[PDB]
């Protein structure tokens, strides 16, 4: 009926970093908060130990998204999937131009939010 | 009279952060009222 | 690995109706807790 | 210090359709709900009479949006602004085809939500 230690979530972490007594009375509820790169998408950010001795929870976080970085002068900013954490955008230059810098950038953890890994390249000539 | 410039994407992000803010408001109200 | 098909627009709509649902939840919880 | 009758809002209506006593003690709060075509965008859907004898409120509703109606076989569905209440989309057919039906459709009040005023045309020949 009782739980062992909770499973680790890829999207959130426990709020108290307490002793984590390896055993928990049935009915215990543990509070979580979103990891960097994630934002809350549900009202209940808990894990609860049910009568079967198992931890129950929803995926209560989703990816943060980066702001669109704007236009590339004489080139193109291409979205491949979206601007969410982990996603990549691609850069190219128009016919009469050379691309100097990176052809890609990725939404990554930055500060306490999310930002682009690489600066926009330049299209020159 | 201007088509949303695919900044559909920025709007989706803002809407999701605003939901998250609502969720915080919801349990912060629900905590101290209990 | 598929670019959102400008159904960015449908997603924006869903997100707005979901916020509205949160707002209803918020005052329905706030009413009966007062 | 006291209020007269509240102003009519284009986006919401009062909840009780009571006598509407033309005068209201300062501090009175009146509850509103969104009109057809609109959805809630704020937690406080009230008008309140302040100490100056004036009704105070936020725009607590926004437009509902219609779902995208999908593809036009051998033609094109063009968004002009968005798919919000009051907005119009446009239809055209490819070179080898005649458009039979309407060249436009509008997001309008339908049932208890919002839907397209005109059905999709056909592209024929």
Curated annotation (Swiss-Prot), chains A, D:
Residues covered by the Sushi domain: 2-63, 64-125
Gene Ontology MF: a single term: RNA binding
Compartments where located: Secreted
GO terms under cellular component: blood microparticle; extracellular region; extracellular space; plasma membrane
Keyword Disulfide bond: yes
Tissue and organ expression note: Chylomicrons in the plasma.
Signal keyword on record: yes
Keywords: Complement pathway, Disulfide bond, Glycoprotein, Immunity, Innate immunity, Repeat, Secreted, Signal, Sushi
Main location: secreted
SS bond partners: 3-49, 34-61, 66-107, 93-123
The protein's role, per its UniProt record: Controls the classical pathway of complement activation. It binds as a cofactor to C3b/C4b inactivator (C3bINA), which then hydrolyzes the complement fragment C4b. It also accelerates the degradation of the C4bC2a complex (C3 convertase) by dissociating the complement fragment C2a. Alpha chain binds C4b. It also interacts with anticoagulant protein S and with serum amyloid P component.
Summary of subunit composition and partner proteins: Disulfide-linked complex of alpha and beta chains of 3 possible sorts: a 570 kDa complex of 7 alpha chains and 1 beta chain, a 530 kDa homoheptamer of alpha chains or a 500 kDa complex of 6 alpha chains and 1 beta chain. The central body of the alpha chain homomer supports tentacles, each with the binding site for C4b at the end.
Protein's name in the database: C4b-binding protein alpha chain
Lineage: Eukaryota, Metazoa, Chordata, Craniata, Vertebrata
From Swiss-Prot, chains B, C:
Name the record gives this protein: M protein, serotype 2.1
Assigned protein family: Belongs to the M protein family.
Gene that this polypeptide is encoded by: emmL2.1
First and last residues shown, out of full length: 53 to 86 of 407
Summary of the function given for this chain in its UniProt record: This protein is one of the different antigenic serotypes of protein M. Protein M is closely associated with virulence of the bacterium and can render the organism resistant to phagocytosis.
Compartment(s) where it occurs, according to its Swiss-Prot or TrEMBL record: Secreted, Cell wall
């Amino acid at each position: 009926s009782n739980c062992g230690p909770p499973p680790t979530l890829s999207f959130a972490a426990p709020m108290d970093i307490t002793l984590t007594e390896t055993r928990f009375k049935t009915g215990t509820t543990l509070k979580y908060t979103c990891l960097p790169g994630y934002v809350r998408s549900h009202s209940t950010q808990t894990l609860t130990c049910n009568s079967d001795g198992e931890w129950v929870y929803n995926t209560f976080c989703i990816y943060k998204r980066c702001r669109h970085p704007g236009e590339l002068r004489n080139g193109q900013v291409e979205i491949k999937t979206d601007l969410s954490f982990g996603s990549q955008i691609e850069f190219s230059c128009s016919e009469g131009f050379f691309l100097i810098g990176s052809t890609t950038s990725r939404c990554e953890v930055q500060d306490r939010g999310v930002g682009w890994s690489h600066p926009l390249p330049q299209c020159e000539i | 009279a201007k088509l949303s410039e695919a900044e559909l994407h920025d709007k989706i992000a803002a809407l999701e952060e605003e939901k998250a803010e609502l969720f915080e408001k919801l349990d912060k109200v629900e905590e101290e009222h209990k």
